[PDB]
Amino acid sequence: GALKRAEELKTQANDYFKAKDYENAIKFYSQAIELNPSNAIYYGNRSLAYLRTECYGYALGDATRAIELDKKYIKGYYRRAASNMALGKFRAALRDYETVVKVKPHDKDAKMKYQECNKIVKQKAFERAKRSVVDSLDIESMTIEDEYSGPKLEDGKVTISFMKELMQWYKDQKKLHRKCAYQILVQVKEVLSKLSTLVETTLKETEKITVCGDTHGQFYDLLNIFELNGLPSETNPYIFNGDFVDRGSFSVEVILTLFGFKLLYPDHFHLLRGNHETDNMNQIYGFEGEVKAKYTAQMYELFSEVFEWLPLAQCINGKVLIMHGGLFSEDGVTLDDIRKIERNRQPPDSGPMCDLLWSDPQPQNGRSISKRGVSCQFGPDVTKAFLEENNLDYIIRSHEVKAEGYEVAHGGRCVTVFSAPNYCDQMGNKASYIHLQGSDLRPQFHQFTAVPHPNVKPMAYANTLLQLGMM
């Protein structure tokens, strides 16, 4: 009876979507949905709100539903395309654009989109059918140029001098030379491949370590961290909880700067794998696109090879466990399980290694279908179980943007840390890094902000169907 009250929340959710308050935009579109669940618009918007929050799964859900309650909701078809795109589902997205270019024959763009998705669908599949480095020569062939005025690997070693030089180089655009980049990649892969899936570090009674979350190519923020918290070293260790690339337009600077420090302080500088240190994700969000623009489409092939040798989780003093995503779908899972995972490869569509990089904590109890469409969500009980069954106090993960840079959930058992401030030059969130001390493994949150960067918009690489999706 209240179709007036139903649409009172169709502007009190359709409003906070303007103030980039998608968490409330969603929480109100829902209440509006609950009252009147037959309005395609409500679903269409709640879908976009899910897109802006990276909840691709749910975004696909609302989109589909919006399309059932109205086959004339062009918005719905687009919103659903984007959802599929994000999950990487090529054809599934093409079929939607196809259905649009028809109901709107004289609709420009609609063709730009169909022809665009098409190109990709053909290619993606076009690529089918051994070690990449076994090929390129490097130290051998690889020459250099006297015209090259930037950082050279002092005897292909990596020095504190090279790092600082390299960083200044990067602060001013300018790419490191291929020969050095390849050398860094080959060495880091060597070093990474010799690490167990579950790195285990022991923090002395005194002596801290710093934990950072998603970085996402936000290079000039990586530098803000190093200035604000000190450069990496044996006396000032660091650990970056995955997601160093994609979305940000300086993933190549960020990544080579991290691998660089990985080589300089391989026992005090830790990198864990994230859902985005994956080929599937790299080819939709910019890294592949960026690596090919700045180097060769073969440099990228080597990146994804080292990305597979990145540990999946790290445990500090047997008390704190940190991984990019979260806990698991299945209830078994133990610290030993993790160690014995065959990391070197792309991730399974489900299972441990998958949850380890994609799961999100949940307020309520028990698992649930992930808003993302992959892995699952988990309740405080699941966190407590795991914690207990492994003699772990709490977990530190990233994987999700957070207004205040971090978030403590599940009574303090699940901690989220995010290191990309103003996420995509649009969220406007603070970011944080954690100080973990041996004598007191209590998370010490440190917030940092904005900090300016050269032009170049987020996702300046990668086909345009995405850049046009995220904004």
Binding-site residue numbers for substrate are: 216, 247, 275-276, 372, 399
Annotated binding site: 214, 216, 243, 247, 275-276, 324, 372, 399
In whole angstroms, the minimum distance from the beta carbon of 421 to Mn ion comes to 13
Q: Applying CB under 5 A, which of residues 214, 253, 290, 305 lies at the interface with Mn ion?
A: 214
Alpha-helical segments (H) within 104-218: 110-126, 160-171, 178-193
The pattern of x and - marking residues 173 through 212 that bind Mn ion according to CB under 5 A reads ----------------------------------------
Single out the segment in contact with Mn ion by CB under 5 A; choices: 64-72, 239-247, 280-288, 337-345.
Answer: 239-247
| C-beta closer to Mn ion: residue 35 or 252 | 252
In whole angstroms, the minimum distance from the beta carbon of 215 to Mn ion comes to 9
The H or E element containing residue 385 is helix 380-389
Angstrom distance (rounded) from CA 359 to CA 326: 5
Angstrom distance (rounded) from CA 400 to CA 380: 17
Q: Which residue is nearest to Mn ion (CB)?
A: 399
CB 429 within 8 A of CB 423: yes
Q: Should residue 275 be labelled a site residue for Mn ion when binding is judged by CB under 5 A?
A: yes
In whole angstroms, the minimum distance from the beta carbon of 352 to Mn ion comes to 17
Angstrom distance (rounded) from CA 413 to CA 217: 29
User: Crossing angle for the helix pair 251-264 and 219-229, nearest 10 degrees?
Assistant: 40
Q: Should residue 14 be labelled a site residue for Mn ion when binding is judged by CB under 5 A?
A: no
| C-beta closer to Mn ion: residue 39 or 241 | 241
Size of the site for Mn ion (CB under 5 A): 4
Identify any residues that bridge with 272 across adjacent strands, giving them in sequence order. Answer: 241
In whole angstroms, the minimum distance from the beta carbon of 12 to Mn ion comes to 29
The H or E element containing residue 305 is helix 299-307
Touching Mn ion, residues 393-422 (CB under 5 A): 399
Q: State residue 52 phi and psi, 5-degree precision.
A: -60, -25
Residue 212: closest CA among 223, 204, 201, 203: 223
Say whether 177 is catalytic: no
Q: Which of 268, 276, 410, 453 is catalytic?
A: 276
Angstrom distance (rounded) from CA 422 to CA 365: 31
| C-beta closer to Mn ion: residue 96 or 400 | 400
Touching Mn ion, residues 63-82 (CB under 5 A): none
Single out the segment in contact with Mn ion by CB under 5 A; choices: 27-35, 193-201, 273-281, 326-334.
Answer: 273-281
Q: How many CB atoms lie within 10 A of CB 277?
A: 26
Residue 218: closest CA among 456, 406, 39, 405: 456
Q: Applying CB under 5 A, which of residues 243, 253, 288, 355 lies at the interface with Mn ion?
A: 243
**Active-site amino acid positions:** 276
Residues that bind Mn ion (CB under 5 A): 214, 243, 275, 399
